[PDB]
């Protein structure tokens with residue numbers, strides 16, 4: 001037992017990271033089959049990022065202006081194109097280490113592993129969540145752009161995120177692998193507001209189930225609540241409304257613990273209204289919302305890949 | 306920027322996890338060169354574990370009583386021996402995926418990545434600390450024994466932990482890869498006490514430096530303290546004494562931020578005596594002690610592997 005923020009094993013993805021240089025800038029790209037993907041701002045000088053015309057900037061570039069390195073293997077660029085905010089570089093070699101893979105656009109509240117990368121070499125792996133305002137709380141320095149986020153199901157890597165920018169908040173923003181930003185963001189160095197964020201209620205409930213499974217029981221009370229009355233308190237404390245869809249997704253956890261979902265909501269209610277009183281739940285003094293119901297089941301049942 | 310519990314990329318170690326079966330029990334083994342390392346309690350039945358004579362039990366076992374699967378292919382066991390609490394199974398095939406590697410017995414307070422596996426297949430990766438009472442707060446289910454903990458040093462994998470048991474606390478105990486338990490623990494299913502834990506002071510200070518580096522400067526105070534004077538309040542709150550050696554280890558962080566180590570202690574002192582008053586530091590409402598000085602610099606300067 002025990003409960004940790006656990007990332008997927010990163011070996012499948014490590015074999016796809018390459019270094020993409022154009023001009024002076026170097027960042028990471030994703031090498032799948034004979035295509036390398038990376039953020040289009042690799043083609044910008046520091047002055048362009050204030051107000052970049054990416055189409056005009058790309059036209060000044062040809063295949064040989066792109067240096068792609070996979071370790072020391074120097075890939076030859078034989079084609080380049082823009083898809084939204086990603087550059088696709090056609091290379092003469094298919095990646096032999098290519099995993100079975102999908103490109104997925106994930107939904108707010110879902111989680112994914114990030115393989116943080118510099119100069120085409122992996123540095124570390126950690127778990128993130130897509131916040132409701134389509135940002136992530138990552139750990140990214142200069143040179144990390146092009147690092148990817150992913151999930152794994154048995155053998156198939158689902159790529160969902162590529163890193164592009166850090167906001168003024170210290171939060172992070174990026175695209176899916178078709179190059180469409182999550183959220184309202186553009187790849188321009190001008191002030192950009194992230195919306196108001198809120199707490200992912202179905203994830204907090206799933207983490208309370210994990211707590212109960214592991215013996216942390218003190219917050220279970222003798223009360224209950226309705227969906228509409230719980231939602232009244234959730235709006236008051238900036239929580240997503242709970243829907244019957246969320247209730248259904250919590251079925252597996254509800255069934256394994258014999259605690260009804262609305263019983264667990266009444267515990268959350270009392271935690272929100274009365275705080276934690278200095279006690280902890282699974283070692284945290286705050287309510288955790290970075291664990292989906294699938295994350296809890298995978299860790300409490302032992303699913304492998 | 307940002308600050309996350311970041312694990313090492315696990316690719317080099319995934320290619321080393323095999324499945325080891327003896328009789329009815331199956332757990333994980335580490336396959337390096339022509340040797341498979343796994344916990345010796347694989348040779349036990351559920352009744353032997355109450356009071357096992359391991360030398361006597363190993364004598365009932367033959368090479369062909371052990372069966373090692375690496376993914377789908379079988380390895381031929383041609384030799385078996387007991388080194389303390391690990392079994393070394395000589396196989397006929399050197400692991401083609403063996404990384405450059407060392408075996409290391411780490412010190413309390415140090416951290417490592419854990420690759421959690423079941424049936425020889427990786428499930429997830431997370432960061433852990435060797436607590437001062439030589440346990441770790443992990444996440445391990447049935448079948449997880451033989452999962453390893455490790456650090457990476459560019460190309461070299463330093464193996465430091467093999468998982469063995471769960472203690473009454475829900476905490477975890479294990480050995481180094483020469484089979485010597487960390488702590489006073491033995492591999493027998495009887496009541497075993499972990500000693501009283503304490504909070505790793507030099508790690509808490511390293512995490513305050515990470516907070517300052519990332520913009521949380523509220524805890525910075527307009528007081529200071531002395532080594533001895535700090536140790537009086539640290540002992541009162543079950544913190545390790547701060548030694549000059551630890552002061553020297555925090556040099557790099559001290560130099561980059563321009564805050565002397567003894568200044569940071571006086572902020573920590575006032576956090577301990579006065580709590581956090583409902584504020585957070587790097588998104589936590591508790592004092593974090595699972596980041597070494599080296600983990601902070603790795604994450605706040607971008608070291609790759």
Ligand SMILES: *C(=N)[C@H](C[C@@H]1CCNC1=O)NC(=O)[C@@H]1C[C@@H](C(F)(F)F)CN1C(=O)[C@@H](NC(=O)OC)C(C)(C)C
Nearest residue numbers: 041140142143144145164165166167187188189190306
């Ligand atoms: C990628 N290598 C960096 C990663 C960034 C640096 C510090 N922490 C990070 O995550 N990405 C950038 O620098 C982008 C590229 C430019 C642009 F997005 F194309 F405009 C500028 N970038 C930014 O992240 C800026 N943020 C911003 O403009 O928010 C609106 C900052 C961080 C100011 C350079």
Ligand SMILES: *C(=N)[C@H](C[C@@H]1CCNC1=O)NC(=O)[C@@H]1C[C@@H](C(F)(F)F)CN1C(=O)[C@@H](NC(=O)OC)C(C)(C)C
Nearest residue numbers: 001346445448449450469470471472492493494495497
């Ligand atoms: C290995 N696959 C398991 C992992 C264990 C199961 C539940 N959570 C875990 O981490 N290892 C064991 O079950 C060991 C093997 C036996 C022995 F250590 F060799 F004696 C018993 N094990 C335990 O972990 C027991 N703990 C214990 O006796 O500590 C005093 C329990 C968890 C009671 C089976």
